[PDB]
Assembly symmetry: C2
């Protein structure tokens, strides 16, 4: 489009720069791709552009790392099993101010850059919120000029590709590397050994871990560009490789696959501990290889380890990399020969832990037998940490034996386990939750005893999202109308969006916000038509619930509301209702039966609603296939209503909530997670808040939740449960949804029925405001304008100042 090249936030199309981009495009098509224009495909053109853009990172990548060596700042190591990065081409162009130049160069070559961008595979190396937070954090750490290093695993297969077949989720391997990854640099020369199994000999000058099996860790380094500051940081992802030296010869070569399976595939558990040995091996793999780099780089700076916490921070993204605590102790004591007490002082000052969930089934609780077999020296070190930690508890709280049992790292029972959260708190100088309400409940309840011992350890760091990917990349139209009024500083100073409150009565700004939303809705409809031949009514409210499928996130409550809308149309067909397209998307864990039944229920509801001639285009319910970072970038800018309807107390923070608020959707939600802070920033009058608060959920727990009472008192709810039970939504298999009904009626931990009446009433208010386009858009302006707190730049600045002890800077490196 000619239109999109006039977007000033996308930079300058300099004549020499355009000429050079075309030259290098053609150079890569020839020398790199070994193609000519006769045979070249759109994929070949995508790769020629990707190589051309990647070359623009290299000088800044080398100079940035040279700068950190020379200036010797404190280094931040961000350890995560997940980095949900998405696509890289657009993000690179945005951060280097190359987007308009590349759009013009490709146009001059007879190509549409947006078609080329759709060829790129997502780097889907995460499940959901935690993994995407790691990705936004890498972006903000580079934008803030921090000497920050993301460390994780290079999964051969990321989160599975979801296909919907006969209304059911099917899973296929996410072969994201099939055509190569042009962004990464393989570093085989920097391969390190990781040890497993073996035994401890206690001997010579102390303990020695012997007779181990080795797996090599081969690093792949990916550039992480800051926003227009010439900073390019590194994400290092480890790949498993069989060791150099060793059923017979052929079988021994094939059996190299077993070690190499450590990095083969992302475990698709979101919020659930499965306890597989292979997952424990992945966790140790990342920790062991990463801490070897940390120690080596420390020793090569400007051995005495008193200075180690002044030069190193290790941030633990959940408990997944918790083995960093005993691994650091193992290296410092067994290899560097530090006294235990000195080693422990260093470890606690180096490490900090971010907690992401309250749900008990999420908590990592590894059997001691498994740790004994796989990591015998680490289990010895965990026991020693536990003895010394509980000695501190016993001294602070003399005779409180109940408190000792509650705080122990060792959990008793038929299977003895290590509570990895307790290990992280003991071994960390800072423990944070991820929204105000969550961090408070860690202090008040979940970790109350630990808070009472060491109150100074407990912090809050409300989550955030990067306004590069989640505004400038995905919604250039909105980014442009904002920049037209307040300039471009807001892109790395998002609190400047508050200036937009000056425009709540500005006719041109009201017109333009609505125009941009409508453009985004047309573009999303065009995507569904092009990729799926699915039609949506463009004259409908786009009601969107996208996130992983879980009982706690209550996609089932949304289902009850969609059926309510359907039954109310059938009862009073002549009554006008605001037309809606209700879109639900997200992946279910392959083993999570209830979540897979919920996906089938959503499609089955569509099979009735979307074909009923009385309804026609007044209501449609669609299941958005294969929800992932690139799809979020398409649907979130199109959304009118953001569904954030978790049971109060269950969602620690959320981040999709923030993405919707930044992109001009109004929110319907509970007072849960960061929704509380979003409502505070915008004013509750600008949010559709409904349902039980935490205190109400707790009062129901005290007397007992009886779903039958709700069924007995609410006729419209009874009608729906009877439709589900009798086969109205599965006439070929009338008992198909029996397990959902049984769960709702008798075993619902998430109290769906208890929020049904307030939710339906709140949804009526949504429809009432949508009937007034001017007031809808003015309320949207009040939301976009107060979204600034939810920048991950704010979040990272707080981590830097309050945990890591480093001062952020938006100052440019030279060219």
């Amino acid at each position: 489009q000619e239109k999109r090249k006039q977007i000033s936030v996308r930079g300058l199309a300099g004549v020499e720069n355009v000429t050079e981009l075309k030259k290098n495009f053609n150079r890569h098509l020839h020398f790199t791709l070994v193609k000519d224009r006769n045979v070249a495909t759109p994929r070949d053109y995508y790769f020629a552009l990707a190589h051309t853009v990647r070359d623009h990172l290299v000088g800044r990548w080398i100079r940035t790392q040279q700068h950190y060596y020379e200036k010797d700042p404190k280094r931040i190591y961000y350890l995560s099993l997940e980095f949900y990065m998405g696509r890289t081409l657009q993000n690179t162009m945005v951060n280097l101010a190359l987007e308009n130049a590349c759009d013009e160069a490709t146009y001059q070559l007879g190509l549409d850059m947006e078609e080329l961008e759709e060829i790129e595979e997502d780097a889907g190396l995460g499940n959901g919120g935690l993994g995407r937070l790691a990705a936004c954090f890498l972006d903000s750490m580079a934008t803030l000029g921090l000497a920050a290093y993301g460390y994780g695993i290079r999964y051969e297969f990321g989160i599975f590709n979801q296909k919907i077949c006969g209304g059911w989720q099917m899973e296929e391997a996410d072969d994201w590397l099939r055509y190569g990854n042009p962004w990464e640099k393989a570093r085989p020369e920097f391969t390190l050994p990781v040890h497993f199994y073996g035994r401890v000999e206690h001997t010579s000058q102390g303990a020695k871990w012997v007779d181990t099996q080795v797996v090599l860790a081969m690093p792949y380094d990916t550039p992480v560009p800051g926003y227009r500051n010439n900073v390019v940081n590194t994400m290092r992802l480890w790949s498993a490789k069989a060791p150099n030296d060793f059923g017979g010869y052929i079988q021994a070569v094939l059996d190299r696959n077993l070690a190499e399976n450590i990095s083969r595939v992302l475990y698709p558990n979101d919020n659930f501990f499965e306890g597989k040995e292979l997952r424990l091996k992945q966790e140790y793999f990342v920790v062991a290889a990463t801490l070897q780099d940390i120690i080596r780089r420390f020793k090569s700076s400007k051995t005495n380890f008193d200075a180690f916490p002044d030069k190193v921070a290790i941030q633990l993204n959940d408990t997944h990399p918790s083995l960093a605590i005993p691994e650091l102790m193992r290296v410092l004591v067994d290899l560097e020969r530090l006294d235990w007490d000195k080693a422990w002082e260093v470890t606690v000052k180096t490490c900090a832990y971010t907690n992401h969930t309250v749900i008990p089934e999420a908590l990592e609780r590894w059997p001691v037998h498994l740790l004994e077999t796989l990591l015998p020296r680490h289990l010895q070190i965990i026991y020693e940490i536990n003895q010394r930690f509980l000695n501190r508890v016993a001294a602070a709280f003399p005779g409180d034996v109940d408190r000792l049992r509650r705080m122990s790292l060792v959990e008793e029972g038929a299977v003895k386990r290590i509570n990895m959260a307790h290990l992280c708190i003991a071994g960390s100088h800072a423990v944070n939750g991820v929204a105000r309400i969550h961090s408070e409940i860690l202090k008040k309840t979940i970790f109350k005893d630990f808070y009472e011992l060491e109150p100074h350890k407990f912090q809050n760091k409300t989550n955030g999202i990067t306004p590069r990917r989640w505004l400038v990349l995905c919604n250039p139209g909105l980014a442009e109308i904002i920049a037209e009024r307040i300039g471009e500083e807001y892109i790395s100073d998002l609190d400047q969006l508050r200036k937009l409150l000056s425009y709540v009565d500005d006719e041109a700004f009201i017109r333009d916000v609505a125009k941009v939303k409508q453009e985004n809705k047309l573009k999303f409809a065009a995507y569904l038509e092009r990729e799926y031949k699915v039609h949506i009514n463009p004259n409908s409210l786009f009601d969107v619930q996208v996130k992983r499928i879980h009982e706690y996130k209550r996609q089932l409550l949304n289902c009850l509301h969609v059926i309510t809308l359907y039954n109310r149309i059938k009862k009073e067909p002549n009554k006008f209702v605001v037309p809606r397209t209700v879109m639900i998307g997200g992946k279910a864990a392959p083993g999570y039966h209830m979540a897979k039944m919920i996906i089938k229920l959503i499609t089955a509801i569509g099979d009735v609603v979307n074909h009923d001639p009385v309804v026609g285009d007044r209501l449609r319910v669609i299941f958005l296939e294969n929800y992932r970072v690139s799809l979020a970038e398409k649907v979130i800018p199109a959304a009118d209503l953001s569904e954030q309807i978790s049971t109060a107390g269950t969602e620690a923070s959320g981040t999709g909530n923030m993405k919707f608020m930044l992109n001009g959707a109004l929110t319907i939600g509970t007072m849960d997670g960061a929704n509380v802070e979003m409502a505070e920033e915008a004013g509750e009058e600008n949010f559709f808040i409904f349902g039980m608060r935490v205190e109400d959920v707790d009062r129901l727990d005290q007397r007992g939740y009886n779903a039958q009472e709700y069924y007995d008192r609410i006729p419209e709810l009874r009608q729906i449960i009877e439709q589900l039970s009798s086969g109205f939504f599965s006439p070929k298999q009338p008992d198909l949804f029996k397990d959902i009904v049984n769960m709702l009626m008798h075993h619902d931990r998430f109290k769906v029925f208890a929020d049904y009446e307030e939710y339906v009433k709140c949804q009526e208010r949504v429809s009432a405001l949508y009937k007034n386009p001017r007031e809808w858009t003015r309320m949207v302006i009040r939301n976009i304008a107060t979204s600034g707190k939810f920048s991950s730049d704010r979040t990272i600045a707080q981590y830097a100042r309050e945990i890591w002890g480093v001062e952020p800077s938006r100052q440019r490196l030279p060219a």
Copy 2:
């Protein structure tokens, strides 16, 4: 060295070319390797040079393939399970006339190009002679301007790396891709499906192969440059990939490894049929994917398949790709719907078979049950081919039922099998052996009945070696002294070496041939000192036997001679003997017990001989570790004496024999394989020929070989067998060599003792000539001068004119 840059055969160091090479080297170090001079290692510098040199192939690679599309010549498909390519950097520089320019550019950058060349991994995708012949053939087909396509498998692990530990072979995985392969281009867009298992439904319009398991074949294309003719051909190697769509989800992802194991590792059997299913899958994998390319490219030329054999040749390197015969029939009949008779006419005119061995245990004889399960439609087609073929036999030779049983493709017994050689002869218009003596024995004996049916099918194509890798690359000093007298035309017209017979009395040429040998000996000694801290006496005759370890190649006969030399020194210590360094190298198949015992015997003989103070430096025996193409390039130019001592009738051709003759070694050998033709070309007076001829071996077989008779009649032999038996060469384990003694005395198929006396006497004559350096060197000149027949250019010109029906050309493509 300044010296080596004055070698005119290595081309011009043009000022602009040197400037451009340095610029692009530095460009690749920055943009490709993401390194600076501060961190760069010798490996990084090797890769910067490799990328710089590879870029010089690309324009010619694209133009060559465009030229074949435009001119539409007949295409030659060379199918092999092995391509023993060696290293690529030097070969590329030689063939593009870039060697002196690259040597000067690297020198100006403060680097030694020869040190950089030693960093490159061999592409060790073969076992020995057959695989190396495929590699020399790709080089000669490009030099002769043929539209030739090599097709094979991209093994992740080639022939195992051999370590010698306590005197024994140990095997390690050959991880040749650890640091990447800069020469290949991955072509994931050209991935094709290969089918396995399933069943035949006979139905609709005929047979259909259904319910199969799919493995994808992903091609990697490697350039194959001709010698200074601007021709760059392609070697396409297929890599196994699991199919797009599918113990649970995690196990299903891990289980992708099973399909991917098809291309994991080269079977290290040289001359032995093991019958593993995985090997049959590799063979079908190559054939199925390759023939899909052949059919698609035929259809896109300038469907009627009458023209198919005018546009396609398929050359079968041994029986390994024999399934090409029934696969072509399957495609033509089941997919293209040709009449059987028409399909068979086309298949026989397209296919030709090269036989490489006479040893019965080498012959591929697949169980029918295995073929039925894995390839049910192919087994049906093989049975139909067999019925129609035997009907022809029965018509030509009425009532010769014995002949029908002998010629059948089906072998009867406790396990019914398919004789793949018989399938290849039935389905090929040409069958060739690989030296005159071998091709004659195919007609006279091995395939006598097939010869009697179709005499016109049987041909000879004496093997050859490329004089690029095996003279100009590996022995630039010799190449230069030759070019000083006869110019450079001989490099792709090797019969011009006959002009050197004019120099047998030329004092300067005699001086220079000896000088070059001595330089090569110093360089090889320096290699053993640098890499192994092994000293060799530079004032010794270098007696070299390098080839795979087999009983038929009689490394054991060489052992008997080394012990003879040792015992004769001990008996008469004051008697002068020509000092020797006896070098033996080669790999044993991991399952071949006798070959592994022979390696241990060679090292054990060294353990005594090399430490005996009476012997000191008069005799040394060393086992050259990890013999492979790059080591051949080092040791062969250093050799004085070439050991080619197979039992008469056992070595079909040989090619190492040829390499030694071209590089200035004299040969000691039997009248076996190509040794017969080498002696004919040079004159038998210039060869150390000894031992039984084939007719003598056959006469011993008729009366029975009794090793005891030799033992009883030859005291020096009895002394050695008693030393082996009593533990003289294994004092810590006196019975260690019992199995070798038992085999020699009672079960020796290769008649070692029957050639012992003639071999020792012949070796005396070698020593007598070595005492006369002038006459030694004059005999060497007579050998180098008559080595021209053994160019693979001669071999390929014969394949082209006599089998493929194409005329070779040494004419240049434009720049």
